[PDB]
Amino acid sequence: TTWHRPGWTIGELEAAKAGRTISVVLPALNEEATIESVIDSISPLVDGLVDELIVLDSGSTDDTEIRAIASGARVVSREQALPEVPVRPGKGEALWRSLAATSGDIVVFIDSDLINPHPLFVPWLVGPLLTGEGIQLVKSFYRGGRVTELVARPLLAALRPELGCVLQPLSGEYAASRELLTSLPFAPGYGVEIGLLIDTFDRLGLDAIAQVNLGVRAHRNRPLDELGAMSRQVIATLLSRCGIPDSGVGLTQFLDYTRHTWPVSLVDRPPMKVMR
Amino acid sequence: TTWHRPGWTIGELEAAKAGRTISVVLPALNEEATIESVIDSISPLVDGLVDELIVLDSGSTDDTEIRAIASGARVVSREQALPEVPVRPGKGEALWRSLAATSGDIVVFIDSDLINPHPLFVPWLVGPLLTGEGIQLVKSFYRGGRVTELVARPLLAALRPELGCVLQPLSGEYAASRELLTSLPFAPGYGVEIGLLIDTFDRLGLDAIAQVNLGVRAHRNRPLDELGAMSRQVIATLLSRCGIPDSGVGLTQFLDYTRHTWPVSLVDRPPMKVMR
Numbered sequence: 001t002t003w004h005r006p007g008w009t010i011g012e013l014e015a016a017k018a019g020r021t022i023s024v025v026l027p028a029l030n031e032e033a034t035i036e037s038v039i040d041s042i043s044p045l046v047d048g049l050v051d052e053l054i055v056l057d058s059g060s061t062d063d064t065e066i067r068a069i070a071s072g073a074r075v076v077s078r079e080q081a082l083p084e085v086p087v088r089p090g091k092g093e094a095l096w097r098s099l100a101a102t103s104g105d106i107v108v109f110i111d112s113d114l115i116n117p118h119p120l121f122v123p124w125l126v127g128p129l130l131t132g133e134g135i136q137l138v139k140s141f142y143r144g145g146r147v148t149e150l151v152a153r154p155l156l157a158a159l160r161p162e163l164g165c166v167l168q169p170l171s172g173e174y175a176a177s178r179e180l181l182t183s184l185p186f187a188p189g190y191g192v193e194i195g196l197l198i199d200t201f202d203r204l205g206l207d208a209i210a211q212v213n214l215g216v217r218a219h220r221n222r223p224l225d226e227l228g229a230m231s232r233q234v235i236a237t238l239l240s241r242c243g244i245p246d247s248g249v250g251l252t253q254f255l256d257y258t259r260h261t262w263p264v265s266l267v268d269r270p271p272m273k274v275m276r
Numbered sequence: 277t278t279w280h281r282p283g284w285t286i287g288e289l290e291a292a293k294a295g296r297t298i299s300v301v302l303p304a305l306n307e308e309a310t311i312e313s314v315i316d317s318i319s320p321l322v323d324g325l326v327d328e329l330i331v332l333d334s335g336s337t338d339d340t341e342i343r344a345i346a347s348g349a350r351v352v353s354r355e356q357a358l359p360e361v362p363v364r365p366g367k368g369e370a371l372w373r374s375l376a377a378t379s380g381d382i383v384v385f386i387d388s389d390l391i392n393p394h395p396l397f398v399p400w401l402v403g404p405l406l407t408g409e410g411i412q413l414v415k416s417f418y419r420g421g422r423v424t425e426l427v428a429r430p431l432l433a434a435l436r437p438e439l440g441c442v443l444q445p446l447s448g449e450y451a452a453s454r455e456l457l458t459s460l461p462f463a464p465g466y467g468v469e470i471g472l473l474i475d476t477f478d479r480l481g482l483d484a485i486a487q488v489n490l491g492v493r494a495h496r497n498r499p500l501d502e503l504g505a506m507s508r509q510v511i512a513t514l515l516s517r518c519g520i521p522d523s524g525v526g527l528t529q530f531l532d533y534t535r536h537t538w539p540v541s542l543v544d545r546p547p548m549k550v551m552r
Contacts, residue, residue: 231427235431252441
């Protein structure tokens with residue numbers, strides 16, 4: 001079911017929990033400028049609709065951690081989330097680790113780089129999980145997304161056209177059941193969102209997936225070269241899910257000219273279940 | 277060999293022809309604003325280094341044709357290039373047809389949407405073909421190319437990493453031997469450049485390919501949605517060359533929201549040789 005405008009009240013949603021718990025995770029790498037506003041947008045839900053909120057600090061070297069703490073948030077490093085396992089770089093590692101630092105029956109992810117996010121983001125994402133039937137994953141969409149419109153959607157049309165109806169496959173804002181998340185491998189780096197989406201679909205089909213309009217997104221837009229690497233990992237992850245061998249060769253860029261090669265990973269983390 | 281700065285004189289290049297001829301093709305769909313300057317940048321070479329110059333008018337409905345004529349250019353419609361074969365849409369069709377409207381041993385393509393192009397573009401592109409050994413294809417590069425850096429190069433790294441060294445795989449400015457071009461199929465739409473590059477490489481290897489710095493490119497930059505479709509066709513063509521089945525499903529876009537689906541083609545034109 002694709003929603004265009006939520007309506008559930010916070011109280012209705014709370015009633016619908018029926019014993020289920022909700023954890024919220026904000027992954028963060030150097031987001032000192034935006035993190036406070038994001039935390040503040042959600043913390044009023046804590047001890048109510050939300051049972052648990054954490055910042056997964058992914059190696060920040062700015063004031064991200066101290067500002068998050070000063071916002072009353074529990075901050076968890078990659079190392080603290082799962083200390084027995086050495087840390088790998090990239091976003092997917094942080095999200096995967098975050099499963100071990102939470103216990104909610106439902107887990108909600110929100111990027112920490114959002115500019116003044118609506119306080120109803122979380123309620124809007126959990127709606128279908130709480131009041132739906134068979135929904136295990138909820139993606140957000142909103143109203144310029146160069147990677148999404150040039151890379152991910154066109155590749156989905158080519159290789160998983162059934163997912164053509166997903167407006168924001170790379171959305172960093174989404175919610176899912178712990179049962180699902182701990183049953184899926186996690187792709188490395190920026191491949192994580194697309195992997196979760198494709199894996200979910202391949203395993204449960206579209207009926208287990210919803211998407212909700214969160215309105216409009218403001219975010220620290222980004223340099224082309226970093227987008228190159230992101231696109232590369234998205235590709236790697238997507239090709240893998242489609243049974244296609246990726247060279248494992250990183251994107252090289254020429255900035256006469258100088259050359260730089262960005263890392264790409266063909267290694268997923270296994271389902272957090274195997275870590276029990 | 278990758279050049280960074282040409283030096284050949286026009287006279288040296290002319291001497292090097294040794295009986296070989298040179299045709300120049302400007303494909304054009306609704307470029308009334310830029311076409312004159314492009315024609316004017318090249319016509320001084322005609323009857324000298326360049327034996328032949330044409331505009332391949334690809335269905336323009338603006339003043340492209342009359343302005344090109346007024347610039348002294350021979351204008352050739354898709355229909356006139358090959359009248360026995362009904363016309364298909366897209367850039368690849370125009371370029372393929374252009375082989376039948378030219379007779380140069382060497383063929384040079386230049387996009388008609390360039391803003392005040394250097395008059396040495398053509399000389400710089402033909403340099404390696406004339407003075408090199410074994411070069412059959414010359415690509416340009418220059419100094420924001422969203423499709424190139426987000427789609428084509430990252431996919432090449434994944435699937436033909438040997439072509440990672442190509443700075444502008446989608447460049448509309450390039451030159452090649454008739455022998456090569458008439459021996460290759462032509463991908464439809466915006467897939468044409470990438471197809472020619474991959475096919476050339478697969479068949480003759482890197483040693484037959486050069487790239488030359490033309491400096492900097494100014495061009496009528498472009499709406500995201502049109503870039504989506506372009507990216508989609510590039511993908512289709514690239515997947516095909518890599519032995520990967522494309523769904524044939526067009527990209528859909530949602531502009532509440534309204535939906536539009538863009539065409540994609542999995543059909544190449546065969547080598548112009550078969551039309552003999």
